[PDB]
């Protein structure tokens, strides 16, 4: 309870009464929110934390037997919100944290007033009638490259994920990937890149705001309309006509403006 608040570097900041949870995605820690955070401090009580796989978390907390699916990540998120006495919040999740939020809302339909999903995909692998963006052989090459030379893999991947030519964003993202223990990054990548959340989307009943860029290395644009059509509540797509997977790093003014609109 307090042990987990300390383990996952939980931070609560801001002068507002309405609770806003900012949950980082794959390859980052809560520092990925630094550029947009100031724009939410007056109107919100902002909760930030690190996923157990973040480089900022002691690797002794990464229980390989436990963290084989997204369900225990959901257990950690809900244990934090319960320990903080949060009855209701708005939740923002980037990439894997979008899927953790979805599963959390199915378990606790009353806890979230809305989900904001950034760079979200329920499935990366192509299927008969479904474009996720990747064939199994392409995902296997990522795992093989990661294992063979982690530094070379990070240096090649970070600029593709950022997409746009924003060197400060490439450096920021590379730093958090390099902070991660390589066996943990590979394990988490197998969890995420092989995931399939499609079957549970219709169980969500809270409103979802789906933020999608026009050119995201990891998320075809058609996944955003798939999410709009398959999540079970009232859904809004926020099109960002820019390039990249990490708009909170590469387009923070535009992202903060869109997040303010989604939260109103
Ligand atoms: Mg280009």
Query: CA-to-CA distance for 153 and 147, rounded, in angstroms?
Result: 9
Among candidate residues 195, 216, 217, 218, the one labeled active-site is 216
Nominal resolution (angstroms): 1.6
**Paired tokens of 33:** 């929110």
216 is catalytic: yes
Query: CA-to-CA distance for 116 and 21, rounded, in angstroms?
Result: 10
Distance 27 CA to ligand 1 centre (A): 21
Distance 169 CA to ligand 1 centre (A): 15
Query: CA-to-CA distance for 157 and 149, rounded, in angstroms?
Result: 12
| CA angle in degrees (0–180, nearest 5) for 140-141-145 | 120
> Phi and psi of 118, rounded to 5°?
-120, 130
3 state SS of 21 = strand
95 is catalytic: yes
Long-range contact pairs involving 123-129 (C-beta distance under 8 Å, separation at least 24): 123/195, 123/196, 123/197, 123/198, 124/192, 124/193, 124/194, 124/195, 124/218, 125/193, 125/194, 125/196
Regarding beta strands 44-49 and 18-23, do their DSSP bridges make them parallel or antiparallel, or are they unpaired?
parallel
In the chain, how many domains are there? 1
Query: CA-to-CA distance for 223 and 225, rounded, in angstroms?
Result: 6
Among candidate residues 29, 94, 95, 218, the one labeled active-site is 95
Residue (of 176, 204, 17) closest to 116 by Cα position: 204
Among candidate residues 217, 245, 248, 250, the one labeled active-site is 245
Query: CA-to-CA distance for 5 and 49, rounded, in angstroms?
Result: 8
Number of neighbours of residue 192 by Cβ within 10 angstroms: 18
24 is catalytic: no
- 136-148 helix and 150-162 helix, angle to the nearest 10 degrees: 130
Q: Across 119-259, where does the E strand assignment appear?
A: 208-215, 235-243
Are the CB atoms for 10 and 47 separated by under 8 Å?
Answer: yes
Distance 222 CA to ligand 1 centre (A): 20
Rg (CA), the chain: 17
Domain that holds residue 231: 1-264
Residue (of 24, 237, 14, 21) closest to 111 by Cα position: 21
Query: CA-to-CA distance for 209 and 203, rounded, in angstroms?
Result: 16
Regarding beta strands 89-94 and 208-215, do their DSSP bridges make them parallel or antiparallel, or are they unpaired?
unpaired
Task: Report the CATH number that the domain containing residue 216 is assigned in CATH.
Answer: 3.40.50.1820
Are the CB atoms for 162 and 177 separated by under 8 Å?
Answer: no
- 182-193 helix and 136-148 helix, angle to the nearest 10 degrees: 170
Cα first-last separation, the chain: 32
């Amino acid at each position: 309870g307090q042990t987990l608040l300390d383990a996952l570097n939980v931070r609560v900041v801001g002068s507002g009464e309405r609770v806003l949870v900012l949950a980082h995605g794959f390859g980052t820690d809560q520092s990925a929110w630094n550029r947009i955070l100031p724009f939410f401090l007056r109107d919100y009580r902002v909760v930030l934390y690190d996923l157990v796989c973040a480089g900022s978390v002691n690797p002794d907390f990464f229980d390989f037997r436990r963290y084989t699916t997204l369900d225990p990540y959901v257990d950690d998120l809900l244990h934090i919100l319960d320990a903080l006495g949060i009855d209701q919040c708005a939740y923002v999740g980037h990439s894997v944290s979008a899927m953790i939020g979805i599963l959390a809302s199915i378990r606790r339909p009353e806890l979230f007033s809305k989900l904001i999903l950034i760079g979200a995909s329920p499935r990366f692998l192509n299927d008969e009638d479904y474009h996720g963006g990747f064939e199994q052989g392409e995902i296997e090459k990522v795992f093989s490259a990661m294992e063979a030379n982690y530094e070379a893999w990070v240096n090649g991947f970070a600029p593709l994920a950022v997409g746009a030519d924003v060197p400060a964003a490439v450096r920021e993202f590379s730093r958090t990937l390099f902070n991660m223990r390589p066996d943990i990054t590979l394990f988490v990548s197998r969890t995420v890149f092989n995931s399939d959340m499609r079957g549970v989307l219709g169980l969500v009943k809270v409103p979802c705001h789906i933020f999608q860029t026009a050119r995201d290395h990891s998320v075809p644009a058609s996944v955003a309309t798939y999410l709009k059509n398959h999540l079970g509540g009232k859904n809004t797509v926020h099109w960002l006509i820019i390039e990249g997977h990490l708009p909170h790093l590469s387009a923070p003014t535009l992202l903060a403006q869109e997040l303010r609109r989604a939260l109103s």
